[PDB]
Design a protein around this ligand. Structure first.
Ligand SMILES: O=C(NCc1ccco1)c1ccc2nccnc2c1
Ligand SMILES: [Cl-]
Length: 283
């Protein structure tokens, strides 16, 4: 195989980043980029990502629809968050706070703008730099959904002929976004402990059973090096009933996140990236 003439005309292709993500160079700027190849839902992913504009959400620079789909993204020099947590690697409580706060802001943004990621994992969280204190970006919107429903339209009529299950679904409705709060809860547990909450390692109970019951594997020795504020937040996010489960808003109001130094550090990392783009001010 070869890359399209159109892609080749703007970008110089180099080393593979993840076997599909490649490193390329924009000919115009000589700046480095990341080119995501999705082999022939991608039109929706582009449509979502072109509209979304937030520091903690990955931006589309360019797109090519050929024998395969080619997506040009900003290069995240720190790689995946997954690589920082593999093999029971533990992140300092302060680095968890910084990263998590950014994931909360990013997800709040998505939900405010009616998008549900649906696939939040440490492998979809990208670190901006090789340094511990850095900006994080949420990637991979392949699985995302966009929120007026068929239920809202149905309820405008009289339920003479309406099925009972439809009327029952009304209670639970409009809480699909709560799936992302579960994921953040599972991510936060992994960062804080080095191990996952629900797993088939040294257990008799099925993975479906642990998750449905909401009974995560708790190892005191590991959680002793973690604060009660941190663990309280996990407990509040890893709630079975989605209606009772914490929202990004509630999470962002939690004592663990009321850390003026952490907020300052992110704000300081923000302007650090913004110095490049900065157009002279009016005043
Ligand atoms: O391996 C990566 N970074 C490490 C690194 C350092 C220098 C070049 O690469 C990597 C992987 C997937 C990505 N997907 C979208 C945007 N940036 C990405 C970066
Ligand atoms: Cl080629």
């Amino acid at each position: 195989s070869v890359y399209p003439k159109a892609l080749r005309d703007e970008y110089i292709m180099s080393k593979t980043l993840g076997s599909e993500v490649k490193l390329a160079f924009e000919r115009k700027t000589c700046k480095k980029v990341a080119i995501k190849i999705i082999s022939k839902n991608v039109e929706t992913e582009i449509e979502i990502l072109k509209k979304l504009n937030h520091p903690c959400i990955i931006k589309i620079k360019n797109f090519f629809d050929a024998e395969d789909y080619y997506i040009v993204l900003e290069l995240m020099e720190g790689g995946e968050l997954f690589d920082k947590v593999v093999g029971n690697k533990r992140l300092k409580e302060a680095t968890c706070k910084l990263y998590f706060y950014q994931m909360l802001l990013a997800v709040q943004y998505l939900h405010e703008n009616g998008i549900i990621h649906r696939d939040l994992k440490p492998e979809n969280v990208l670190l901006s730099s090789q340094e511990e204190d850095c900006l994080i970006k949420i990637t991979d919107f392949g699985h995302s959904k966009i929120l007026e429903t068929s239920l809202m339209r149905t309820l405008c009529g009289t339920p003479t002929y309406l099925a009972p299950e439809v009327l029952v679904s009304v209670g639970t409705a409009g809480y699909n976004r709560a799936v992302d709060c579960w994921s953040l809860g599972v991510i936060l547990f992994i960062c804080l402990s080095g191990y996952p909450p629900f797993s088939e390692h040294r257990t008799q109970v099925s993975l479906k059973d642990q998750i449905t019951s909401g009974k995560y594997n708790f190892i005191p020795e590991v959680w002793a090096e973690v604060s009660e504020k941190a663990l309280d937040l996990v407990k509040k996010l890893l709630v079975v009933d989605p209606k009772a489960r914490f929202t990004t808003e509630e999470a962002l109001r939690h004592p663990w996140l009321q850390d003026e130094d952490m907020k300052r550090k992110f704000q300081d990392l923000l302007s650090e990236e913004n110095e490049s783009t900065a157009l002279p001010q009016v005043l």
